[PDB]
Amino acid sequence: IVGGYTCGANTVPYQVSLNSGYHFCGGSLINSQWVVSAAHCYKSGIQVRLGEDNINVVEGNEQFISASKSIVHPSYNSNTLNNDIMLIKLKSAASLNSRVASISLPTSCASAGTQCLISGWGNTKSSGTSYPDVLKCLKAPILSDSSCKSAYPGQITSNMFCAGYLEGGKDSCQGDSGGPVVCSGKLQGIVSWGSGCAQKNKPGVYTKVCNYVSWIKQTIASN
Ligand SMILES: [Ca+2]
Ligand SMILES: [Mg+2]
Numbered sequence: 099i100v101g102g103y104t105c106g107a108n109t110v111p112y113q114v115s116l117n118s119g120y121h122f123c124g125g126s127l128i129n130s131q132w133v134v135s136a137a138h139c140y141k142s143g144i145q146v147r148l149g150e151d152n153i154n155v156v157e158g159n160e161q162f163i164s165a166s167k168s169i170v171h172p173s174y175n176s177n178t179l180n181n182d183i184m185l186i187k188l189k190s191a192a193s194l195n196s197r198v199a200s201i202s203l204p205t206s207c208a209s210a211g212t213q214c215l216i217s218g219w220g221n222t223k224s225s226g227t228s229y230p231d232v233l234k235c236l237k238a239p240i241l242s243d244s245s246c247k248s249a250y251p252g253q254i255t256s257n258m259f260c261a262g263y264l265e266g267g268k269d270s271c272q273g274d275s276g277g278p279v280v281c282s283g284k285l286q287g288i289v290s291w292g293s294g295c296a297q298k299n300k301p302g303v304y305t306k307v308c309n310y311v312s313w314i315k316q317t318i319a320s321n
Contacts, residue, residue: 099216100224100296101268102236107151108159110217110233112201112285115147116186116276117162124218124277126285127200130191132318133165135276136288136305137174137184144168146188149197152231153219159197163188169317171310180255182290182305185317203315204284207308210242214261214281216302218289220273224266224296229273236270238262240281241301249299257309259287262301270302271295279304 114125114133123139125146133146149159166189171181192198208214216236222228238261246260254260261279262269270277270289279287287304294300 099218099220099234099236099274100222100271102216102234105217105233105235107157108149108197110215110235111197111199113150113217113233113278115150115153115219116141117145117147118143121153121219121273123275124289125186126278127192127198128203128285128314129200129318130194131188133186133188134285134288134314135184135186136182136290137170138176138179138182138290139276140168140170140184144186146186148192151233154231161192161198163190163192165189167321169321171313178253178255179291180257183288183307183310185314187321201278201280201285202283203311204286204308207306208240208281208286210240212240212281213237214240214279214286216261216270216274216277216279216289218270218274218277220275221271221295224294236268238268246301246303249301250293250303254303257306258290258303259306260301260303261287264299264301266296266298266300269296
């Protein structure tokens with residue numbers, strides 16, 4: 099996350115770190131047995147880490163649970179990143195508490211202008227590499243599809259939205275992939291892609307979760 103701030107330990111209790119020997123993607127806990135992340139984060143051998151703040155120091159509120167199964171969206175296209183969403187079931191149920199909580203799925207899509215919260219352990223420089231060990235946060239508004247489509251002609255589908263600042267300066271970056279974009283108490287997006295980080299007229303692009311609620315509910319209940 100570039101230009102954001104330190105969230106504070108466990109202030110984003112639904113935030114997950116996917117680890118395959120190191121942190122490689124974020125995710126969101128939607129209930130004790132399931133996590134939603136990005137399909138481009140798919141890997142075999144994932145351990146889900148809950149209640150994290152510093153990812154290199156066991157501070158006491160973590161739960162590390164292995165994944166039993168992963169389900170990438172049936173229509174994920176890794177070339178365009180359309181339908182960039184995946185579900186991860188935990189081998190054991192998490193123990194929800196103040197530090198480990200789930201986030202709600204949306205009932206309707208959010209409007210442009212709505213302020214959201216983006217969080218992750220990704221790169222914090224736009225031009226450089228500095229990976230933080232504690233969770234960083236960024237409040238950013240959803241942009242109009244018009245400004246999103248002008249920035250990326252022929253690349254945005256109805257399953258994507260942009261959030262950020264066209265002036266640049268604040269944005270998600272690598273290491274944030276798969277993490278949450280929460281607006282008004284609901285999980286509305288997933289960090290998917292963008293052009294570099296915090297560049298001018300290049301906002302980050304997010305998976306539009308409100309379009310996958312029936313698929314998520316149907317899939318988790320049948321698995
Ligand atoms: Ca830790
Ligand atoms: Mg993240």
